[PDB]
Design a protein around this nucleic acid. Sequence first.
RNA 1: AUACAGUGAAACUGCGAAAAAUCAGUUAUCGUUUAUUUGAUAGUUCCUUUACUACAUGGUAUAACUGUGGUAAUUCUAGAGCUAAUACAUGCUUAAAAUCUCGACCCUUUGGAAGAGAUGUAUUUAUUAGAGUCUUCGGACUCUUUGAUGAUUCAUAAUAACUUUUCGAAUCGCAUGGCCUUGUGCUGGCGAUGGUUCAUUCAAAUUUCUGCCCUAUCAACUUUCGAUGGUAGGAUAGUGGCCUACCAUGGUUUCAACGGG
Lengths: 148, 137, 247, 41, 297
Amino acid sequence: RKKRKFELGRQPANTKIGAKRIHSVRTRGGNKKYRALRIETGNFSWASEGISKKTRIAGVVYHPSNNELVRTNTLTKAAIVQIDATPFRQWFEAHYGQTLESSVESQFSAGRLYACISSRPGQSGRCDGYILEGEELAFYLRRLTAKK
Amino acid sequence: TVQSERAFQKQPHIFNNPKVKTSKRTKRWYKNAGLGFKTPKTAIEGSYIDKKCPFTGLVSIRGKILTGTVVSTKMHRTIVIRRAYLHYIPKYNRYEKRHKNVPVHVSPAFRVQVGDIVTVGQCRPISKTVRFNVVKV
Amino acid sequence: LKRLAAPHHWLLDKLSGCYAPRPSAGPHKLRESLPLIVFLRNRLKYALNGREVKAILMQRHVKVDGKVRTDTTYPAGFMDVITLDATNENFRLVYDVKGRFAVHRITDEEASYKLGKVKKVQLGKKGVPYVVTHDGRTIRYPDPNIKVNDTVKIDLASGKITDFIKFDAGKLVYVTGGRNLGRIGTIVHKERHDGGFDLVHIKDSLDNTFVTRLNNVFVIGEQGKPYISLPKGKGIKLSIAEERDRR
Amino acid sequence: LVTPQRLQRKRHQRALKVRNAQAQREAAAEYAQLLAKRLSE
Amino acid sequence: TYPILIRNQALIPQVAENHFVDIAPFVYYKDEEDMENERVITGVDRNVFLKTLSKFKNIKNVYSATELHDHLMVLLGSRNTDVQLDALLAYKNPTLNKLLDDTLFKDENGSQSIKAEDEKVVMPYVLRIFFGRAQVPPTSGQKRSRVISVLPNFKKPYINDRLDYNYFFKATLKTIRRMTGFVNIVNSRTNFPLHTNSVLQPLIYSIAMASTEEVHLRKMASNLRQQGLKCLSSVGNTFDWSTSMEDIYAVVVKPNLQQPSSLLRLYWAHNPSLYQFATATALMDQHVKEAVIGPII
RNA sequence: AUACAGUGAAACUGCGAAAAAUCAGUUAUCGUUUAUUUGAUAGUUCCUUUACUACAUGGUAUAACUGUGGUAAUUCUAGAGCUAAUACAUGCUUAAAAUCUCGACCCUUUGGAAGAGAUGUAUUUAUUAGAGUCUUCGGACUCUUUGAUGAUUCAUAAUAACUUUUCGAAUCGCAUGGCCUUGUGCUGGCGAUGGUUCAUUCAAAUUUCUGCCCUAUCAACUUUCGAUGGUAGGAUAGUGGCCUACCAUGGUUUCAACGGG
């Protein structure tokens, strides 16, 4: 158990969207990990009201460390993705009675929201994101202006 | 100025709710470092991020507490400390002089002056060579 | 099978082959326990050689603190009892004035229980408070006035607690480990640093104010009324030169 | 094959689980009364 | 029987035997024989029309003998895809009978068979079971995300569970139907579903006032869910025709139901309650009475 | 002994064969694994169940074996058919559940209770919590609700989901006992293995600092192909440029860095 070597690495998972595949990988000392390869779905959660749903991810539109990952549509941690917005819209209509915040009510009728990945599906085994709302929504709208 | 990177400066698992309101914008987390080290109000109400702060970040100080003096601040968010301890080997029969150098992680909640005396604590590894952490000047 | 430099308070013979027994995993550490091979082979001499010790272990004659533990390299370390059903014997193994494992012949009504210092009090699962002790008996539902570095009195029929000695300034104490081994008495000073190197200081018949590490000390009971018996005049280490001067 | 032994073993397993749960939920109530008297003092 | 079904799988005269078997399958060892006969029959005209309805029942549910076998659902979906856009719906329903990505993709006969196979393969898989909670939440999410779908779901609930005496005024099947009604009202055709749920709650009340703990827990959960359904809906004719005998039996007991009596009394709700009236007894007979008094006043 | 029973070839299975450079110590793991031993550890798998159900317990897929050969040798082989499980792969666990509140009412309580309500673990997130009198003179009258650490975003509980899935015993040797509804009926012991999580144990892993020869006719070394830091990510049992991007241009040193034996 747990020897040491000098200098090497391994090949990344660098997962995509479409044809979700999960490959298990051997971990020394419990917690047998899972590399997600080309995963197309994810668990996405509202921050304020606190409701998750599994949702088809549409695509990552921003990455803060490599712009080429947005071109290749790579799902790492801390990215900006679009998903569906419809089950969160369904819960919103069902349990608030509004049947529609300002800058997310403007995103509802646009159709797709923005969220942040918090798992590491290259190593963990699943993808989760929470829908950005508040000052995170402010700086990421400024990051949309940094896009345009 | 706070934001200085392509990524948003995140302090995870602690976030405000927009429907509730306070004059803090995030339930800002702070901790006392221990061994009598006391957090300052400038470090508390400073809205700096510092994910490697030993009062508000993720790291916790423990064990060794050394002293030293600042020799340079010519690195981005890391400082270098000197220790010119008095030294004696019996081959010399005299109080000879050496010096010991180390890099120490630094926080944006504290002024830095080349020459003043800093009290430094031991923490987890932070860089390739930075292992310690500033806790108090 | 690495050996021939054992913990030298075991006092095995050096012209006894080459090796020395490896204590397996168990309730105590490596160099502060004493396996039953070293016990029954060169400490009281009931069996000559180690396979005969394996025979008397396999034939269910020996039980450490309640159950049998049919194992040669079983590190039955400090403060437990060994109820040899034949020979009517209750070996409690405690410490001495010099650093060895002194033996007793305990009565049955005292061998029915054992005690030990706790190491932590925690909340385990589903909000259940459980304490540990030094020999790994992580037992649930204490009285929640149990503090760290305190002693409970395990019932040894069940694993329940019958009583505890809430240590503070001034209740009778034992020591274990370090160069001030085997001493008693708890009342001079109570030092508390931040990071160890502290003791409840000791007072004896000669009132020797002594200290060690707080990890190297644990409690017994009230002054003059101890819960455990102690071997050979309740070990003091006055002086051997003064002993040969008086008697 | 269903010999008389195997269902006896299954019966003993089921009664073992129920009896362990019974003793545990007795000890929880005992600690509850102990915390009650520690409150009262 | 198993040998003969194996011979029929090893098989005009086969279609005439299939017509006789269509009679026997419209009527009703039997589980393995039904599996073998379904695997044979998935590989006439009016017997085909009746067998399409029987296979739609077997791909919408496995209600009587078993409870939602996945092999039975696969055999019934293969028979329905052999009987009757269509290719894409068939591939999505086949991946659903194989559930997460299929529900994410499928989030009008194809819609009927889709609600059929979805509530079949997640037809109350268990209580918790470390996956049945997620499966029941997935079925509720699909039923809320797919009005014809909810109408067909209430239609299947009523098809599980005469009606004239059940609207005017089998214990184990009634307990299973009460669990079905609790599971149906567990979701986040309204008049027929309310009539069937009121009939189930009234029959549970009668058989409980006459297994008894099963009927008690099912009637309690069904009454709490009925109060929740009336509070989430908020017609007074069938409302009075349901509430009359229930509150009459709960006349002395009311000294769930009290929260319904306090939620159906706060303008048009006040008219709906004064259509019945008792209320002073509900006020006088504690925070559970204090909130009702200091709201109803 | 018409399932076998103690004996045991062979084989399957289970386990174990893992010249500040080295180190001698020291510090932490509130920065990881925690196999083996030891101690506590878990009622929840079907209820669109009466045209009522695999659990008195369901399925393959093969060794050894039998048979056909090759071959020049044997720790070489190909084909075929059998037959097992703590191997492999599924899988339901019978007052359908069961337990604690509230217990109004009675009858006097140490109750017995009609009905108002709740109930696993694991994985990955996002939160939240986690900080002066009356006095039968006897006592009471409401009191200020939380574990530990020097230190937590710790331990843990709940919340809303996702689980390609986790576990929640399809196992084994000895005795055969108590009951009465005499039925292959209900229950029952000693303890071998396996499994969830926590603690302990040893074992591994880094990491802290104190310490070794001769040198300046040895003073500059390193950013190339990250040399020195930050930020985010990949990874990894794991911190950490260990690597990938963008930013900054550093760091070591004459007290002998760097090189020479």
